[PDB]
Amino acid sequence: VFKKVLLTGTSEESFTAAADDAIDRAEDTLDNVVWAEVVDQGVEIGAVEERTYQTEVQVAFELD
Amino acid sequence: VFKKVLLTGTSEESFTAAADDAIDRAEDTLDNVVWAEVVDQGVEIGAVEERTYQTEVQVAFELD
Amino acid sequence: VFKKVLLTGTSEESFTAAADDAIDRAEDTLDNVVWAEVVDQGVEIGAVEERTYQTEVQVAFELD
Amino acid sequence: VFKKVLLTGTSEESFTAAADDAIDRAEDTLDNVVWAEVVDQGVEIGAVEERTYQTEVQVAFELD
Amino acid sequence: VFKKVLLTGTSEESFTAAADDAIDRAEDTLDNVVWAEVVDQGVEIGAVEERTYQTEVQVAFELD
Amino acid sequence: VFKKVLLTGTSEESFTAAADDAIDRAEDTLDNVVWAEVVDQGVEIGAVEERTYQTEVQVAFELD
Amino acid sequence: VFKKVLLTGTSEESFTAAADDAIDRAEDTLDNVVWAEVVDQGVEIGAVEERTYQTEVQVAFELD
Amino acid sequence: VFKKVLLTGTSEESFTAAADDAIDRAEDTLDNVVWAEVVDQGVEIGAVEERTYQTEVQVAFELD
Amino acid sequence: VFKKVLLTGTSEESFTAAADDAIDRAEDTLDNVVWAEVVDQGVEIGAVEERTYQTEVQVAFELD
Amino acid sequence: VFKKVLLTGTSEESFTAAADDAIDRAEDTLDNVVWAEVVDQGVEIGAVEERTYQTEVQVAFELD
Amino acid sequence: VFKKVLLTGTSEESFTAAADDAIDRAEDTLDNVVWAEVVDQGVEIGAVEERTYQTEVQVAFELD
Amino acid sequence: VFKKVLLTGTSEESFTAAADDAIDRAEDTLDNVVWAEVVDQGVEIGAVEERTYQTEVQVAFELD
Ligand SMILES: [Cl-]
Ligand SMILES: [Cl-]
Ligand SMILES: [Cl-]
Ligand SMILES: [Cl-]
Ligand SMILES: [Mg+2]
Ligand SMILES: [Mg+2]
Ligand SMILES: [Mg+2]
Ligand SMILES: [Mg+2]
Ligand SMILES: [Mg+2]
Ligand SMILES: [Mg+2]
Ligand SMILES: [Mg+2]
Ligand SMILES: [Mg+2]
Ligand SMILES: [Mg+2]
Ligand SMILES: [Mg+2]
Ligand SMILES: [Mg+2]
Ligand SMILES: [Mg+2]
Ligand SMILES: [Mg+2]
Ligand SMILES: [Mg+2]
Ligand SMILES: [Mg+2]
Ligand SMILES: [Mg+2]
Ligand SMILES: [Mg+2]
Ligand SMILES: [Mg+2]
Ligand SMILES: [Mg+2]
Ligand SMILES: [Mg+2]
Ligand SMILES: [Mg+2]
Ligand SMILES: [Mg+2]
Ligand SMILES: [Mg+2]
Ligand SMILES: [Mg+2]
Ligand code: NA
Ligand code: NA
Ligand code: NA
Ligand code: NA
């Protein structure tokens, strides 16, 4: 059985590095992370000093 | 990093109050709730005495 | 077996009251109405004196 | 010919009143506003003292 | 309030039995599981000796 | 000209048998049923003793 | 209150004429037909001597 | 950089001629119109003497 | 078994004639073409002297 | 690099067996078939003596 | 009230840099740009000497 | 007439470089590749030593 958690990673450098930020967080607290699906991307501008890239992923992990 | 939980709130008064019912529940058990996205709405009729409005939301919260 | 009819309700007050207007109509002419799913919302402005809220629902009813 | 502008209205009271906030703004600066389609709804929580309801609409107006 | 968890069940026999595999897992660890919505289906071929059917479901459960 | 009716069939055995339950009902009351498109699938759990599979179909029939 | 019926019109000439074929049928049997939304288009080739264009529409009519 | 404007053209003859009606309007007031994407089609019936075909397009133009 | 190929036809006259341009090409090189589904439409303007209508279709053919 | 082919399998028994019919065909003519994604399901009724279940899949295979 | 403009940025280096190209343009001519949502990505190949990455964004800005 | 092939490119560096990996493969075996549309992105984690970025594209090429 797999389960997915819906995480948004952020990076001031790229959409790829924001996806990696969400996956790193998942791997700190979950075992058996097996793949992530991008479901959305965006850029925070007003609320920040530097633009922040956001990549939202479903991060799948195998249960047991 | 943000994470989202997928909650359906209910209200016998309105779609807005059913969204608030899901967000109140999230805020009772999560810190740093930052925003909710509506993803679906519906109305329970058969199973109930009064119509019940349902508003399903992804409730985002900032991790740490 | 359930069947759905695709109805748009209208209200000069709210999206919730326009959903109720479609469901009331379904319950006047159908037995066993069991739930409704919102599929669209909009507001009539040009063609009317007051703004009219519209909420389109699939209204499900149990057949027999 | 119709044209649409993509506006997000906000309200501390309801999704209906946030849709009206976007339409009022359109009517202050456009002639011949004829109807609006809801395309998204959400609630601002972290960044505000009171929850703020948001209703994003395509606001259509007739050109000439 | 309902909450949903996003699970993928697997079966070497059918899409129905893979949906049941995700729901059985949910019922082992959650109380008040009330319904599941299929959101995707697929078949693992390369990585396995027998084809494995996968049925991904949002499994809804009533909170309290 | 074809017309479609939106029916949900149920079965305690499989998604295929729930699609057949909706089509059998259509064929009892409509002439010239020509094909069905699956548009959704789900499983009733809380409200029932046995899980019930549901397969919602647009059932197309040729008019005349 | 509006209701919609889901009809597919056919024409050996164009997608526009197949939409008109579905609307003409609706107007033969319904009062107060007010507008149609195209939801799909396709072309029958194998089963026919001439290609047949198909335009599927939700045909809305005002109830009363 | 391209920008898109969301226009609905109308024609009493065809969906193609309603798309052309939106593009002609864009070309009267914009320089460098480069392509249009159809996003919706429909037919006005109740409000008019003749059926009016509508084709909504994103009309893209190159900025500078 | 059916297979589909994803083709975009073009025409300087109509969306219907651009769909026919993709289907004619499929029938020149495939046997047993049985039907086509429209999946997108657009109009080339900048790159051409006359507007060119484009209709993208999945063209299905029966294998053997 | 993976490539996908879009195949519809058929079965007079189930949606699972129609998915297997498309995958078997892919494996007869392609090397390195690695997984399939269901994208649509339907049932042929008018044109046949027995109902025929159809399951359309993108069948992915690894290139080289 | 927020408004969105639909811009496509281009870059010969990355999807992230094409999103930044659309946002920079928005910030040259709009005040209060607050965030952008990616809605599409693609790559121009035939018409150019170097591949050009394109990232289309809705760029939101706060009105007043 | 254009045709599209559905390819997934992979890269251990970025989503942009995985899109380029699919396009390079298309250009090795097809003439007249003219543009690619991103349709999905994801990251392989479990099955690999380094994360692998995947970008799935429809790669369009002009036929003749
Ligand atoms: Cl989710
Ligand atoms: Cl419907
Ligand atoms: Cl838009
Ligand atoms: Cl495809
Ligand atoms: Mg930096
Ligand atoms: Mg987002
Ligand atoms: Mg009350
Ligand atoms: Mg729901
Ligand atoms: Mg009043
Ligand atoms: Mg509507
Ligand atoms: Mg107040
Ligand atoms: Mg929004
Ligand atoms: Mg076995
Ligand atoms: Mg999946
Ligand atoms: Mg049994
Ligand atoms: Mg359902
Ligand atoms: Mg003729
Ligand atoms: Mg169809
Ligand atoms: Mg005329
Ligand atoms: Mg429209
Ligand atoms: Mg000519
Ligand atoms: Mg296209
Ligand atoms: Mg048999
Ligand atoms: Mg199909
Ligand atoms: Mg360079
Ligand atoms: Mg694009
Ligand atoms: Mg490296
Ligand atoms: Mg994928
Ligand atoms: Na989730
Ligand atoms: Na219907
Ligand atoms: Na717009
Ligand atoms: Na394809």
Author numbering:
A (entry chain A), B (entry chain A), C (entry chain A), D (entry chain A), E (entry chain A), F (entry chain A), ...: 2 to 65
Manuscript excerpt for this entry:
Dodecin from Halobacterium salinarum is a hollow spherical dodecameric protein, which binds oxidized flavins with high affinity, whereas flavin reduction induces the dissociation of the holoprotein. Herein we use the riboflavin binding protein dodecin as a redox-sensitive probe to study ET processes through DNA monolayers. To study ET, dodecin can be reconstituted on flavin-terminated ds-DNA adsorbed on gold electrodes. If ET through DNA is possible, applying a negative potential will result in flavin reduction and subsequent release of apododecin.
Prior to adsorption of apododecin tE, a non-binding dodecin variant dA was added as a negative control to show that apododecin tE is bound specifically to the flavins.5b To minimize the ET distance between the redox-active isoalloxazine subunit of flavin and DNA, different flavin–DNA ligands comprising only the first five bases at the 5′ end (oligo 5, O5) and flavins of different lengths (CofCn) were synthesized. Dodecin was reconstituted with these ligands and X-ray structures were measured. For all the flavin–DNA ligands, electron density can be traced for the isoalloxazine moiety (and the first two CH2 groups). For the CofC2_O5 ligand further electron density indicates binding between apoprotein and linker plus the first two DNA bases. As shown by superposition of the ligands in Figure 1 B, the (rather deep) position of the isoalloxazine ring of CofC2_O5 in the binding pocket is similar to that of lumiflavin, while all the other flavin–DNA hybrid ligands superimpose with riboflavin. Efficient ET could be observed even for larger distances between isoalloxazine and “molecular wires”, when the flavoenzyme glucose oxidase was reconstituted on gold electrodes, but using molecules other than DNA (e.g. single-walled carbon nanotubes) as the molecular wire.5f, 9 In the X-ray structures there was no electron density for most of the linker between DNA and flavin indicating that (also after protein reconstitution) different orientations of DNA and redox-center relative to each other are possible.
